[PDB]
C-alpha cells in the first residue's frame, strides 16, 4: 500500500462519520459523541480540519435553546476541541464563551464557568481575553446559586494561579475588590478565596430581580439609588414608573440591604442578559406527565380480569392482576 493514500482514506472515513453524528436527529447522539470521543476526533481530523469542520459543527450546538443539556455538553467538550484547534481557534470561541456565562439554564452557567476554568487552566485563552473574562465573571462571586457561586470561585482561583503575582495585585485584585470582604494577597489558595468572599445575594432578592419584567427600569432605578450612595446624585427621585415603585418597595420589604443593592448592580450585566435569554425561551414554548397513546398511534393489548420467558412473565402479570382485581371486589362486596 501507499501510506498517504491509506491514511487519507482513514481520515476521509472518520470525517464522514463524525459529521454524520454531529448532525444526528436525536440530541442524545450528539451529547454521547461529545462525551465519548470529541478529543479523539480532533487528532483524527487534524489541526486545520478540526477548526473548520469540527469547531464549526460544535458551535451549532449553542443554538439549541430548547435542550439545555446539549448546551451544557457543548461547554463540556469545547475544551477538548479548542485544545486541538489551537490558539487560532480562540477568536472563534471567545464570543461563544461569553454566551455561556449568560445561559437560560442555571446549570449551563455552572458548566460554562467550569469550562472557562478548564480553558484558562490549559492556557487556551489569550492574555487580553483572560482579564476581560475575569471582569465579566467577577460579579458572579456573589450569585445566590451555590453552583454558580462556587463556579465563580473556580474561575477566579484558576485565573489567580495563571497570572504573575505582580499582575494579580495590580490587575486581578481590582476586578475582585467589589466582591471580597478582605484584601488578601494569597488569592492563589482556593481555601483563602472561598473564605474571603462576601455573602451572596439573597435568593429572594436575586430571584425577585431576575424575575422582574421591567429589569431595565429596575436597574435604571437601582442605578439612581447607587448614584445616591456614591454621592454623584444629591437625591434619588422616586421611581417614575409605578411598576418600579412596586418592585423597589418589594425588594426593600424583602430585606434588600445596601450590600445587596451593590451586589445586584455588580451582577447587572449577568442578570440583564439572563433575563433576555429567559424571555427568548418563553417565546418558543403534553406538558402533563401523561403519555397519550392515541397521539402515538400504538395499539395496546387488553385482557379481561373478570372471569417464552417473556410470555411466562406476562402470564404472571396477568395472573397477579386477575387475582388482585377479584380480591378487591370481594372486600367491597363483603361490606
Amino acid at each position: 500500500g501507499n501510506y498517504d493514500t491509506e491514511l487519507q482514506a482513514l481520515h476521509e472515513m472518520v470525517q464522514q462519520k463524525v459529521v454524520t453524528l454531529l448532525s444526528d436527529p436525536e440530541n442524545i447522539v450528539k451529547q454521547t459523541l461529545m462525551e465519548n470521543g470529541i478529543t479523539r476526533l480532533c487528532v483524527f481530523f487534524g489541526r486545520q480540519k478540526a477548526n473548520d469542520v469540527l469547531l464549526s459543527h460544535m458551535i451549532t450546538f449553542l443554538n439549541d435553546k430548547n435542550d439545555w443539556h446539549l448546551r451544557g455538553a457543548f461547554f463540556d467538550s469545547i475544551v477538548g476541541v479548542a485544545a486541538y484547534v489551537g490558539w487560532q481557534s480562540s477568536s472563534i470561541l471567545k464570543p461563544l464563551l461569553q454566551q455561556g456565562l449568560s445561559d437560560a439554564e442555571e446549570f449551563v452557567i455552572v458548566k460554562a464557568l467550569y469550562a472557562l476554568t478548564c480553558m484558562c487552566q490549559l492556557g487556551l485563552l489569550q492574555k487580553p481575553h483572560v482579564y476581560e473574562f475575569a471582569s465579566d465573571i467577577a460579579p458572579f462571586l456573589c450569585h445566590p446559586n451555590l453552583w454558580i457561586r462556587y463556579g465563580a470561585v473556580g474561575f477566579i482561583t484558576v485565573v489567580a494561579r495563571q497570572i504573575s503575582t505582580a499582575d494579580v495585585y495590580c490587575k486581578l485584585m481590582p476586578y475582585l475588590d467589589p466582591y471580597i470582604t478582605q484584601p488578601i494577597i494569597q488569592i492563589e489558595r482556593k481555601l483563602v478565596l472561598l473564605s474571603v468572599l462576601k455573602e451572596p445575594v439573597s435568593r429572594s432578592i436575586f430571584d425577585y430581580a431576575l424575575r422582574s419584567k421591567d429589569i431595565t427600569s429596575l436597574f435604571r432605578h437601582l442605578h439612581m439609588r447607587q448614584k445616591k450612595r456614591n454621592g454623584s446624585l444629591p437625591d434619588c427621585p422616586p421611581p417614575e414608573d409605578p411598576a418600579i415603585a412596586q418592585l423597589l418597595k418589594k425588594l426593600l420589604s424583602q430585606g434588600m440591604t445596601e450590600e445587596e443593592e451593590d451586589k445586584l448592580l455588580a451582577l447587572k450585566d449577568f442578570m440583564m442578559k439572563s433575563n433576555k435569554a429567559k424571555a427568548n425561551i418563553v417565546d418558543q414554548s403534553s406538558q402533563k406527565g401523561v403519555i397519550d397513546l392515541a397521539a402515538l398511534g400504538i395499539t395496546g393489548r387488553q385482557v379481561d380480569l373478570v372471569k417464552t420467558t417473556c410470555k411466562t412473565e406476562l402470564q404472571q402479570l396477568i395472573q397477579q392482576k386477575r387475582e388482585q382485581c377479584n380480591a378487591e371486589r370481594i372486600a367491597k362486596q363483603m361490606m
Binding site: N145, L191, S195, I298, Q302, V306, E313, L314, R329
Partner: protein, 249 residues
C-alpha cells in the same frame, strides 16, 4: 375500593417514546458532620452541608442494565430550594421504551456542592424499571436514599431503593405501602378505624423519623393513557411471538 374490569397493557417494544421519570422532592434530614470533621478537611465548611437552607441539589438519573450504563446521566436543572427539596421536574431519560432490557434499573444520585467545581454525592437510590411481574412501575414511588453513597447500577444493586419483602420488613416501609394503597382506594375505608389507625401510623412514622434519619427521594413515572384507559408497559421481546427426525440424523 376501586374497580377495573379490563387490564390494558402494551409491550415495551411497542412504546416508541422516551422513558421519562420525574424526580420530585427529597424528604428527610441530611446529617451535619462534627467540627473535628471540619478540622480534618477545611473545605467541608464551604460544602453544601454548611448552607443553612436546603441546598440546591440535583439528581442525575442514568439507566443501567446488567451493570452497564445504557445512556448518559440526565440531571435536573438547577432550582433554588428554600424550606424543602422539591424538584417537581419531569426528566426525559435517554432510554426508549423498546431499548430497555428486562433487568433495567434507574439509578438516581443526589449531589451537593463540595467546594469549587467538585460535586459529592448526598445519597443514591436504584429502582427496577420493571416490577416483579414485568410491569413497568407506575405512579409515585418513594425510594430510600442511602446516605454518602453514589447510586449503584450493578445487578443486584448495593443501594436498593425498593427493599423487597425477602429482606427484613421495615415496619415503616410496610406501613408506607399500606398508606399509599389506602390513598389510591385499594384498601377498605373504615372511617372510625382510619382515624385511629392512621393516628397510630402517624406515631410510628414520627418515631421512625427520629431514629432512622434516612432520606427518601420521591420519583414518579409517567402514565400512558389512550381513550381515557391507562396502559401498562410490560417487558417483552420483539421476537417473543422437531426434537426427533426420521431422516435428519
Amino acid at each position: 375500593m376501586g374497580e377495573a374490569e379490563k387490564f390494558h397493557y402494551i409491550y415495551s417494544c411497542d412504546l416508541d417514546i422516551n422513558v421519562q421519570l420525574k424526580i420530585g422532592s427529597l424528604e428527610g434530614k441530611r446529617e451535619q458532620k462534627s467540627y473535628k470533621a471540619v478540622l480534618e478537611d477545611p473545605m467541608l465548611k464551604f460544602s453544601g452541608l454548611y448552607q443553612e437552607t436546603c441546598s440546591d441539589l440535583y439528581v442525575t438519573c442514568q439507566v443501567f442494565a446488567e451493570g452497564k450504563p445504557l445512556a448518559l446521566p440526565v440531571r435536573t436543572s438547577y432550582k433554588a430550594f428554600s424550606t424543602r427539596w422539591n424538584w417537581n421536574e419531569w426528566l426525559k431519560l435517554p432510554v426508549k421504551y423498546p431499548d430497555l432490557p428486562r433487568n433495567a434499573q434507574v439509578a438516581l444520585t443526589i449531589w451537593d456542592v463540595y467546594g469549587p467545581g467538585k460535586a459529592v454525592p448526598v445519597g443514591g437510590t436504584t429502582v427496577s424499571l420493571f416490577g416483579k411481574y414485568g410491569m413497568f412501575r407506575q405512579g409515585m414511588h418513594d425510594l430510600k436514599v442511602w446516605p454518602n453513597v453514589e447510586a449503584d447500577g450493578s445487578e443486584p444493586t448495593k443501594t436498593p431503593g425498593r427493599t423487597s419483602s425477602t429482606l427484613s420488613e421495615d415496619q415503616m416501609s410496610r406501613l408506607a405501602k399500606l398508606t399509599k394503597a389506602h390513598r389510591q382506594g385499594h384498601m377498605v375505608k373504615v372511617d372510625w378505624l382510619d382515624r385511629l389507625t392512621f393516628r397510630e401510623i402517624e406515631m410510628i412514622n414520627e418515631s421512625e423519623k427520629r431514629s432512622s434519619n434516612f432520606m427518601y427521594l420521591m420519583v414518579e413515572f409517567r402514565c400512558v393513557k389512550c381513550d381515557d384507559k391507562e396502559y401498562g408497559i410490560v417487558y417483552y421481546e420483539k421476537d417473543g411471538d422437531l426434537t426427533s427426525f426420521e431422516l435428519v440424523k
